[PDB]
Write a protein that binds this ligand. Structure first.
Ligand code: HEM
Ligand code: HEM
Ligand SMILES: CN(C)Cc1ccc(OCc2ccc3ccc(N)nc3c2)cc1
Ligand SMILES: CN(C)Cc1ccc(OCc2ccc3ccc(N)nc3c2)cc1
Ligand SMILES: C[C@H](O)[C@H](O)[C@H]1CNc2nc(N)[nH]c(=O)c2N1
Ligand SMILES: C[C@H](O)[C@H](O)[C@H]1CNc2nc(N)[nH]c(=O)c2N1
Ligand SMILES: [Zn+2]
Lengths: 407, 411
């Protein structure tokens, strides 16, 4: 009931009690673990609100105070009346920061309280959303000195007036099905690169074409918008030794800005809430270049290294994967763009873990996602036991808009 | 209830029905996941249903469920239990059990080989010296001059828990580790505590960086005794690198036979507390864990020095780079000497095939993602994007407290 977790590299033991607060469910049972599965009314709303407000006023050392009680009373009232309710800005911010704080899959959470919240709740149109998004992108980029941000569009009402960013990230590279058979650009984004044209995009049919924003406001049809290029900071990728690297014709964008998630605070459902921070190197280089179902350029890279690509036992894929990731980090640090290496980020996380166990009594963590996709066992998190559980406020997955939209 | 797993690299979807045959607990609940927790005297009361369960599986597998052979066997076992408070497995049953225990080992990426396991029945053993004999023949048989064969040796089951057979070594073959007065460690840091016990038990330690440890064996609950595996029986491979000639000079070598000996085999309620088993190495086990883990030989840095890497900023990925070269060297040294070894890409590929085959033919395949995924280059092996249900089946291999923590010293 008061669980412990052992780091095996260091024998350190943390005790977890925060999990007892856990409110939502995992997908696991006593009989089956699903830790490696990707995605396992006025009456429900009020308990949701109270729980949130209780933790909020507790966090400001005014638990049980007049303001607290009155606020709980005030919200309770508006709920009975309007069937929903609205969050004070302070609550909105506390909420946002805490959904990140509780994002069990996120290795970067040590930064969780330095989040810039943009209240875009007054928005009414796709054009408006576009204006708010450009503003976010510009702010977060900060000439390469990246800052974390989130922009929150009006909460769901009755599932009809839904605000949604159809892009999965604000900034992503187009991907096209070749008549040749293969795939040009980014394969992840193929179906999306279609929907854009299916909705009227004029694709430059290149490789690194920045996808257009497809914003949907108040449940209406979604509209296309193009991000001003001067707002899209990119880094041409080059190796600090292999000068044939730049020849490979590679660059990547500096701003990772996830847009398809649902943010939940005190029962309210912000279905558009694009947020961003900065890349861990391996997100672009292990994942965005070298996944089979992505840029898949490993073969060509090692080809250019004249490595024995005949048998797997030469570990050519590994050697190459390492150089590519060295290049990514090298180019970003060169162009004065924020990035963190996977050793540094995992180190920061262990500290953040220790910090949360100390000041908060625990920290939910999803080992399968926290461990970098390369060099796993030489990062400190590998040997770190982690408890996974779901807390509120949270970020949740949500169905792709094109599977839901009533046109 | 059906459950689906999806491979996100290939969109292949599989459907698990097997998880319904799962009894044992996971550690998990609906409000917490212990999926990354390393570790999450039995009466006639709870024995017979465990036995029936086993025998039922056993007779289904031989397509004789409900046969008179099956029913008499149940009866035979029943009566042997209520009379003797335990029972004995037939040879057929012991073999099936050991194989299935491996097959159910949800953390083992090597399971494709599960049906080809040589089972040595050492249930007639009575002394440590007898144990040394059995173990010696295991090692010789499994080693097969570098052409490794999977094998397990099974010592008598636990009776009253006061007469346990145990192998105190964690693996049959392992290098000593010595903590020095200055704080440094000579040999394998992973083995220091055991090395100490060994020394206290009268072992005369060479105190070299690569001393094969003695077997510390326990029979019928007696105090353990020391035995030196004859060196001609211990196959080793010196570690060199194919392009780096300075590598051999790091003075490295590893033993060829991985043979885990501290686990506990459970079959039909019976507990086999001494059941050393062996297969062959995946390269990363030696290369990534056995040299490069910060709590191991940690030649990561020296390899890095010799490569003249940029060890200043970690964002040079010098650690990553050295790690790769060390694993190249491990695989290369082994293949050159015709000692069986598998690389992580090969092993994971194999596993996916095995797993898919198991879903189709068995209705699932319990698998621990945290352990199946290799400790380097995770996402460029096919298991990384493979969803996996994890659950416990019997027969199984279980952890068990170190015997030095529980053992009652005769003297
Ligand atoms: C500032 C530096 C940050 C770093 C280095 C970082 C790092 C990461 C990494 C490496 C992942 C794994 C994702 C993958 O492999 O595809 C991840 C996931 C995640 N991040 Fe963070 N992040 C940062 C900022 C943020 C911010 C500002 C938020 C939101 C406020 C956030 C929320 C999340 C969430 C919810 C996930 C899980 C996504 C999922 O479940 O699929 N992160 N992060
Ligand atoms: C024949 C080639 C084999 C290969 C390549 C192989 C590979 C592996 C690897 C790489 C691990 C993870 C080890 C670690 O990182 O600590 C593992 C775990 C395991 N293996 Fe296999 N193995 C083989 C044979 C066997 C055999 C013969 C058995 C038993 C009869 C077995 C039973 C297990 C068990 C029970 C685990 C989980 C250990 C634990 O729970 O801590 N394996 N295997
Ligand atoms: C499995 N993938 C192919 C699909 C997938 C796509 C985006 C995903 O979002 C992850 C995510 C979320 C927030 C982040 C914030 C900062 C950062 N550097 N990476 C971040 C990464 C997760 C999964
Ligand atoms: C943290 N460690 C001390 C615990 C630990 C060490 C080795 C372990 O080995 C498991 C294991 C079992 C059987 C194997 C068979 C073959 C093989 N190549 N590796 C195998 C590896 C398990 C746990
Ligand atoms: C904390 C974590 O559960 C633990 O360190 C595990 C992680 N995965 C592993 N995977 C393998 N193959 N071997 C291990 O020893 C471990 N250790
Ligand atoms: C099968 C597994 O659940 C899936 O591939 C996960 C594994 N771990 C991951 N880890 C991170 N950081 N990001 C991911 O997308 C995934 N994918
Ligand atoms: Zn679980």
């Amino acid at each position: 009931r008061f669980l412990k977790v052992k780091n095996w590299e260091t024998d350190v033991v943390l005790t977890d009690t925060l999990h007892l607060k856990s409110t939502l469910e995992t997908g696991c049972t006593e009989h089956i673990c699903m830790g490696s599965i990707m995605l396992p009314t006025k009456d429900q709303l009020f308990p949701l609100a109270k729980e949130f407000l209780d933790q909020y006023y507790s966090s400001i050392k005014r638990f049980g105070s007049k303001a607290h009680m009155d606020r709980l009373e005030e919200v309770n009232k508006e709920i009975e009346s309007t069937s929903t309710y609205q969050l004070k800005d302070t609550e909105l911010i506390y909420g946002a920061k805490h959904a990140w704080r509780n994002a069990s899959r996120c290795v970067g959470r040590i930064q969780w309280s330095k989040l810039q919240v943009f209240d875009a709740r007054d928005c009414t149109t796709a054009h408006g959303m576009f204006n708010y998004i450009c503003n976010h992108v510009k702010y977060a980029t900060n000439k390469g000195n990246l800052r974390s941000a989130i922009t929150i569009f009006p909460q769901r009402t009755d599932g009809k007036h839904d605000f949604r960013v159809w892009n999965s990230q604000l900034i992503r590279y187009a991907g096209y099905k070749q008549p040749d058979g293969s795939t040009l650009g980014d394969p992840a984004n193929v179906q999306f690169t279609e929907i854009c044209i299916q909705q009227g995009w004029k694709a430059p049919r290149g490789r690194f074409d920045v996808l257009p924003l497809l914003l949907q406001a108040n449940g209406n049809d979604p509209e296309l918008f193009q991000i001003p290029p001067e707002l899209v900071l990119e880094v041409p990728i080059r190796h600090p030794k292999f000068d044939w690297f730049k020849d490979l014709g590679l660059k990547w964008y500096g701003l990772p800005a996830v847009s398809n998630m649902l943010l939940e605070i005190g029962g309210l459902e912000f279905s558009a809430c694009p947020f961003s921070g900065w890349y861990m190197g391996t997100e672009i280089g292990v994942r965005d270049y070298c996944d089979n179902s992505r840029y898949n350029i490993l073969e060509e890279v090692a080809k250019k290294m004249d490595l024995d690509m005949r048998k797997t036992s030469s570990l050519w894929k590994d050697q190459a994967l390492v150089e590519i990731n060295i290049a990514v980090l090298y180019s970003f640090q060169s162009d004065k763009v924020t990035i963190v290496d996977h050793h540094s980020a995992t180190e920061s996380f262990i500290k953040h873990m220790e910090n949360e166990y100390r000041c908060r009594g625990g920290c939910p963590a999803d080992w399968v996602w926290i461990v970098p996709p390369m060099s796993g066992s030489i990062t400190p998190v590998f040997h770190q036991e982690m408890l996974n559980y779901r807390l509120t406020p949270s970020f949740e997955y949500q169905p792709d808009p094109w599977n839901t939209h009533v046109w």
